[PDB]
Amino acid sequence: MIVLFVDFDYFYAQVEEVLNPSLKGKPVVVCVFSGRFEDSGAVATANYEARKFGVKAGIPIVEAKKILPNAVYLPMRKEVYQQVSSRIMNLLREYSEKIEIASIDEAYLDISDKVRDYREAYNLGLEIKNKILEKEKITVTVGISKNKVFAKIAADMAKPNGIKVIDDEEVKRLIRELDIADVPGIGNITAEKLKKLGINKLVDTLSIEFDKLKGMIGEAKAKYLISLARDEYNEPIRTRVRKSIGRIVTMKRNSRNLEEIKPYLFRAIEESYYKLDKRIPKAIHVVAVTEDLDIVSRGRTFPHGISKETAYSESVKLLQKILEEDERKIRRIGVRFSKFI
DNA sequence: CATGAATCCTTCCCCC
DNA sequence: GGGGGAAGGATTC
Ligand SMILES: Nc1ncnc2c1ncn2[C@H]1C[C@H](O)[C@@H](COP(=O)(O)OP(=O)(O)OP(=O)(O)O)O1
Ligand SMILES: [Ca+2]
Ligand SMILES: [Ca+2]
Ligand SMILES: [Ca+2]
Numbered sequence: 001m002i003v004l005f006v007d008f009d010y011f012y013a014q015v016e017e018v019l020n021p022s023l024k025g026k027p028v029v030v031c032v033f034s035g036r037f038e039d040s041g042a043v044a045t046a047n048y049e050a051r052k053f054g055v056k057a058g059i060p061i062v063e064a065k066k067i068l069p070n071a072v073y074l075p076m077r078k079e080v081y082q083q084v085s086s087r088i089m090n091l092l093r094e095y096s097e098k099i100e101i102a103s104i105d106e107a108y109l110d111i112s113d114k115v116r117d118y119r120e121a122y123n124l125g126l127e128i129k130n131k132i133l134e135k136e137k138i139t140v141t142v143g144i145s146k147n148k149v150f151a152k153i154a155a156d157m158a159k160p161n162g163i164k165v166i167d168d169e170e171v172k173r174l175i176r177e178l179d180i181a182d183v184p185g186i187g188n189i190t191a192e193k194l195k196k197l198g199i200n201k202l203v204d205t206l207s208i209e210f211d212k213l214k215g216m217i218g219e220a221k222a223k224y225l226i227s228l229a230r231d232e233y234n235e236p237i238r239t240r241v242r243k244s245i246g247r248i249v250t251m252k253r254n255s256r257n258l259e260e261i262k263p264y265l266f267r268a269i270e271e272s273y274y275k276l277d278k279r280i281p282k283a284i285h286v287v288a289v290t291e292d293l294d295i296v297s298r299g300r301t302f303p304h305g306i307s308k309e310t311a312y313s314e315s316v317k318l319l320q321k322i323l324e325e326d327e328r329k330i331r332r333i334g335v336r337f338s339k340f341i
Numbered sequence: 342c343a344t345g346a347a348t349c350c351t352t353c354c355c356c357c
Numbered sequence: 358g359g360g361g362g363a364a365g366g367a368t369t370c
Contacts, residue, residue, distance in 0.1 A: 032344045042344045060342045076344090103370070187369050218350065244346055293343070297365060336346085
């Protein structure tokens, strides 16, 4: 089997260059302003020019300005990136339609039925890198190997504007050499639990006996890692259906007064219904972020679908529920609809 | 100073 | 005991 993985580069920023190419050559930061104070918020992505000087995702806008005060700071326009992505996805559809859309930025492709070997795949790689570049002026990175995981790894190695192959062999070394934290699905929290078990490398998994492993990470995380290191990981590609929709918004100031908060919440809902389009949810959660960045949620599943009118009233019941249980102030509030039909 | 969602986990609860 | 399913939270990207 041959999987081809595609990650678009500094994607929001890149789209921003493509739309105003005067930007090409300057450091660019797409960021998301909360508006509690002037230039509050966080960086979403930045082009490589900016990333050189340590300006990347997650970091606060304030601290990006301490480094690169003469850079360009644009508000995120997600909906645009969304359409552009969609276009790009349709180019790939007609290169193979055994296709998994991971994120806005990433997709996998079975091309067993189109290529025979890693040579002629690479070719498919470049045809695509190119097709996309010509059609949309977008640089991407392409990774290829025998399954989804190693494809994704291939790309991470090759970033940016790269293309890389990890043949049925070189897996070998990675299973021995490659750091466990650079494995997809292993964030800091999980990585540190494994370092704490003397597993800094994908092969160490077999030394330990499963049941201790399972207890500390989880059955599926364990199985996942074991199959990788053992080499039987061969999860397929498929199309993936959206199961959940919802927005979550930041308030002017932390609060526990219901009347101050409800408006913010009614924005989240209406946006969510606009976004729902034709589909109808049976479940609704309300979600609050505390002043010290903790998340609580309360929800409810209905035996039937949910009208706009219902959602409005039911959400108030849940925020009321959140308020008398958790005593902290609320920083951000919002909703999430689940369980369509 | 810190801005959408899938998947997994753990804890209940109902019940046969 | 174990199936079936909900809630709330944990974790990843
Ligand atoms: N930590 C984050 N905070 C906010 N937005 C993010 C974050 N990670 C990713 N995104 C959004 C913005 C990105 O343009 C897009 C895809 O992310 P990702 O592939 O991780 O990096 P990137 O597309 O910015 O550049 P690159 O892939 O070259 O690092 O999703
Ligand atoms: Ca990317
Ligand atoms: Ca990691
Ligand atoms: Ca990503």
